[PDB]
Design a protein around this nucleic acid. Structure first.
Lengths: 228, 67, 196, 117
RNA sequence: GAUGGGGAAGCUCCGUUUCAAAGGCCUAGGCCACCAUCGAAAGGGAAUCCGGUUAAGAUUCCGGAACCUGG
RNA sequence: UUGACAUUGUGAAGAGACAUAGUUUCUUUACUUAUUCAAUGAAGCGGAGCUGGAAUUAUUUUCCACGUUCUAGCAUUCAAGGUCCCUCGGGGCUGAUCCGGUU
């Protein structure tokens, strides 16, 4: 239209004001955000002793999903189910027969850290899952070595929150199975073999090779330019 | 359970794992205020042996004092 | 004693009311770091307690629609209404502030930065100036001769204004009496008379 | 996406107070009601002279009361219309209020009605 | 001279925008910018003059005539 | 003022010793995350091509990116245009290259 005419702008470097731009890379983040980001950077810039970085090698998404699918079949009795079973016991044990035998043998996953460790070294645990994001890392550093010594399959799965949700809790440091249904024996054996080949059979040479020797983006570019 | 594993691990302060965790933790705490609350105890075994209980009413605080 | 008491700064504080303001160069930003910006010296005003007159230079804000006022140290030869260019690409003209790397060796500059971003630290007194005696492109550093005669090397990114600070020859006139000395020290600080 | 480098506290929703118990269990009655605003009339010779020659009443008023409250109390207690109110603090620690009545009211009549002259 | 912080066994010291997630405008949705507070009856300030009046008050009270602010 | 002790970590190279397996102790030189200094209402930091050109080797060496210098004014409304959708007008791309610890 003749009434409409173009007005190109020449922002440049020494003329009319610049327009609005995204400054996410330059914003002054809250002190806690910067502190946590710098902590994350430090955790990767410093040489981590071998027991550290033994985590961060996590079960692949396919095998982790298969393991979680198998575990979902053995979630522990929830509050509503617990109340239903209590009512059944109070209406059958005293009014019927078979003291405490009215209900069948229960099967559920084991997730208590102290209880899971107590199950190991006995030993009855068949499969163990260890969270890789436990803030007090010392709580789980010995679990891989303990499982290796006891010959119990173990996997370092990603996310304690996922384990907790799998067991009706906010978070769970570990999860394990002690007794499983016969129908799932083949699946349990396959998962155990895969987890062993991924972690147990590999955590004898991986005990060496200190990790954490990763430089930053700017440092990486500078060293690459210097080498070139 | 994990009682003795952690109890003995905390004693090997000169080990590489502990000498790295201590460095990370001291760096982290130096950025925070001199006196600040801790969401959960960093040494559950020590807190438990010092009468701590994991229930409402128990609070853990982190503080640093100049040497 | 008096020198020890000076540390307390009870009655020896500077009389800062009548001082026009801190004299500093333009903030080193993207516009000045890469290109240059043009400013207009609106007026030059005398600063209480300082022999070198100050020049009021206004620059438009690159990131906002507003005018930013700056207080530069007036160099001899500058005049009201003159245009001041600040930046790497600024030309070698009196009153312009340029990085020490950009100016050729032998140039005479004043209000030169010790380090990039200090906004001017050296050659601030009236009639004082530094001389760039040599360039060192390898790990760029500029060798300069300070007014005291000592030779120093500083980062080439340091900025400085071409020319000499105005007001030269001020100390060439005998004061002739205690009255003028008292008036001069009235606004500087409580350091006169000096008892033996 | 953000176009400013200055991070600011988000304007989170603030819940209104909903106490589960009464703050004091009983609201306080009027501390400065009309009767409390006016204490006693002043019958000084100058005050009496002002009544007839100025149509201005002189009353003793509590220190807490102000011009608005004095006017309200005067209007309510005696149904009189007040043209203006002037107040001062006596040297003895009491407040003296000079109340001027409108032309529609007579200071002498109200003085007789209240029971002083 | 607090607040955010840093010292001090401690009564308490430093510091006033500094290494704070520091608040305020349009109709449920958008937009805008860095600081508390105190500190002068001789500094800046929004507005009143005349005549008379008491034993003692007035540029305040009366008679007259204007001005500044908020709706 | 000065020697020692902890903050003091991580690479490359040269020399005495472990055990003609291969690990350590010193020396030289490098990296930062420890730590220190300064600035900014943390705005242009690093890298890569650049739609560019200037500029020569044989394959792409080197410079910047390539919107401002006779003048005492002006540069502000999710920026105008183009582009594709849903019309009084509202929304995506470009205008304003892409990716990645404020400097």
């Amino acid at each position: 239209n003749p009434l409409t005419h173009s007005t190109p702008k020449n922002f440049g470097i020494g003329q009319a004001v610049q327009p609005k731009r995204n400054l996410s890379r330059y914003v002054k983040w809250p002190e806690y955000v910067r502190v946590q980001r710098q902590k994350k950077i430090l955790s990767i810039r410093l040489k981590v002793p071998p027991t550290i970085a033994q985590f961060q090698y996590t079960l692949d998404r396919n095998t982790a999903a298969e393991t979680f699918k198998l575990f979902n079949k053995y979630r522990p009795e929830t509050a509503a189910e617990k109340k239903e079973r209590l009512t059944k016991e109070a209406a059958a044990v005293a009014e019927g027969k078979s003291k405490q035998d009215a209900s069948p043998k229960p099967y559920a996953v084991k997730y208590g850290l102290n209880h899971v460790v107590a199950l190991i070294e006995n030993k009855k645990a068949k499969l163990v899952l260890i969270a890789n994001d436990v803030d007090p890392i010392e709580l789980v550093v010995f679990l891989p070595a303990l499982c290796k010594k006891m010959g119990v399959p173990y996997a370092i799965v990603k996310g304690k929150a996922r384990l907790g949700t799998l067991v009706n809790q906010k978070t769970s440091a570990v999860a394990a199975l002690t007794e499983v249904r016969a129908e799932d024996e083949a699946a349990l054996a396959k998962l155990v073999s895969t987890i062993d080949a991924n972690f147990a059979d590999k955590y004898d040479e991986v005990k060496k090779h200190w990790g954490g020797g990763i430089l930053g983006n700017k440092a990486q570019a500078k060293m690459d330019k210097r080498a070139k | 359970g994990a009682y003795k594993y952690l109890e003995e691990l905390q004693r090997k302060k000169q080990s590489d794992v502990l000498r790295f965790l201590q460095r990370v933790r001291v760096w982290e705490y130096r950025q925070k205020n001199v006196i600040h609350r801790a969401a959960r105890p960093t040494r559950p075994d020590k807190a438990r042996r010092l009468g701590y209980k994991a229930k409402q009413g128990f609070v853990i605080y982190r503080v640093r004092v100049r040497r | 004693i008096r020198n020890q008491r000076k540390g307390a700064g009870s009655i020896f504080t500077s009389h800062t009311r009548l001082r026009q303001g801190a004299a500093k160069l333009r903030t080193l930003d993207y516009a000045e770091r890469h290109g240059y910006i043009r400013g207009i010296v609106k007026q030059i005003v005398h600063d209480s307690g300082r022999g070198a007159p100050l020049a009021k230079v206004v620059f438009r804000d690159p990131y906002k629609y507003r005018l930013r006022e700056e207080i530069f140290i007036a160099n001899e030869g500058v005049h009201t209404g003159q245009f001041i260019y600040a930046g790497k690409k600024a030309s070698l003209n009196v009153g312009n502030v340029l990085p020490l790397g950009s100016v050729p060796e032998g140039t005479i500059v004043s209000n030169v930065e010790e380090k990039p971003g200090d906004r001017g630290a050296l050659a601030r007194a009236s009639g004082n100036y530094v001389i760039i005696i040599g360039h060192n492109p390898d790990e760029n550093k500029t060798r300069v001769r300070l007014p005291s005669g000592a030779k120093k090397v500083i980062s080439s990114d340091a900025r400085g204004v071409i020319g000499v600070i105005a007001g030269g020859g001020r100390v060439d006139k005998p004061l002739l009496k205690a009255g003028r000395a008292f008036h001069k020290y009235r606004l500087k600080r409580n350091s006169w008379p000096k008892t033996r | 996406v953000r176009t400013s480098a200055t991070f600011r506290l988000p304007k989170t929703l603030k819940l209104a107070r909903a106490p589960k118990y009464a703050s004091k269990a009983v609201p306080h009655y009027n501390r400065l009601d009309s009767y409390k605003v006016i204490e006693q009339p002043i019958t000084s010779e100058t005050a009496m002279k002002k009544v007839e020659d100025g149509n201005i009443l002189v009353f003793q008023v509590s220190m807490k009361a102000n011009k608005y409250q004095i006017k309200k109390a005067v209007k309510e207690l005696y149904e009189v219309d007040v043209l203006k109110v002037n107040t001062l603090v006596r040297p003895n620690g009491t407040k003296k209020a000079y109340v001027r009545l409108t032309a529609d009211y007579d200071a002498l009549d109200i003085a007789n009605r209240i029971g002083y002259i």
